[PDB]
């Protein structure tokens, strides 16, 4: 069925999947762990309505959200912040700049933040890089499921070239632009990696859900 | 500051002419190995590796272009990325094995010597089957050994520092250029092409968290990893 999408399928579904954008509730890491904690609850409803991610089992769908999770809270924040330049929107209600910072890491989000302005990136655009984020991130550290998540990630490049030959984008344009949108997908990785070990080196190991919290919230 | 003046074919060309050697382990240590054994003949292989890394980096199209202070975060942030693909693609024929050196083919199991090293040795041999899977192309591989230079350091960098970054995300479009016009040119249909190109690109935010948990363990332990000073001394000679 996921295989059967058209590209504006695809878009529509992603879109209509889309989770809101929360306040904070009101210590800068007390507020910031109450605001991702309610966002993973949003995430995995959000990743149910990804096309393809139900038909994988249950511990094939934790293992690519336990892989993903920070990335994808990551590139929501970089989005968010998009026309807040030189400032980060964790919230409406929180929007911090560097001298508030991990600083390191908060110049590198205000760093795709601008990225992501220079190239104009388009909000039908962006879902499609957070889904890419789920489905990839986790799939090479897992064989009928890895042929369908890449079967689903094909899907998806699919659908990035249609919105962009639609946009008026010369083939060569097209696939430049494909290309700049992944090669930034690394640098989220290296985010995510960042944050995990500063997560760590705070004191902070256990707010990152595990395997079992992720399959009872699934469950859920 | 012709690099963007090259073609595809000049391109691939350069790139495969720049290849740096295949280099040999210790040809007789101790087995079987300790931790410290272990660590200590990888350490020395990739050691004398990156002095050909840097010999390589300067002949990618644009790499000089740039300022030396530019030259050298670019090989910090990449030189771990750098030699695990070219690990990866060694290794390519040889499942559930890891060629470090034609002298030193070491499985799965022997990973677990170090702690934390089989887990990664794991995702290595994971990448390994995936560009086999794939039936990944010398002129590919080099082309991702390029975009990783370039790509891994960029986004963390006056008027010179974003011309800087506009020439390396211009030489970057340069070798997508380059990677659509091989796959082109071998047959594939467009669809087909946009498909590989992406999976291709996919493929290297594995990579980078494969060197971001070896770079871990490495700042963990002597100081292995190579210095600012150290790669700008080997870049000016
Ligand atoms: O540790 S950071 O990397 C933090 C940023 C980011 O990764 C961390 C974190 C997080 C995750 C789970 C928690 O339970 C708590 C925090 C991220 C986040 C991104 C998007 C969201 O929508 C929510 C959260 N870092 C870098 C800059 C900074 C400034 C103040 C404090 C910490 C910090
Ligand atoms: O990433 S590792 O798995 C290991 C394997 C492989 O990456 C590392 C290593 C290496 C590189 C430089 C050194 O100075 C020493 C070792 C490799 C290599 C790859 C390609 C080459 O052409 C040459 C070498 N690693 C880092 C330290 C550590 C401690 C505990 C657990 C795992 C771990």
Redesign the interface.
Known sequence: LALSLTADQMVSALLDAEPPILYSEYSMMGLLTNLADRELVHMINWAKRVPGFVDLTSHDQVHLLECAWLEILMIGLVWRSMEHPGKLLFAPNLLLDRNQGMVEIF??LL??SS?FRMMNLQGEEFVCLKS?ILL??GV??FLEEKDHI?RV??KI??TL?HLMAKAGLT??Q???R???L?????????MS??GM?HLYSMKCKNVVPSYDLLLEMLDA
């Open positions: 110049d590198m760093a795709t990225r890419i990839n991130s090479y550290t890449h990630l094909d490049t699919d070239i083939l060569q097209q696939h430049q494909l290309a700049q992944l090669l930034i997908l690394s640098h989220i990785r290296h990696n960042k070990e």
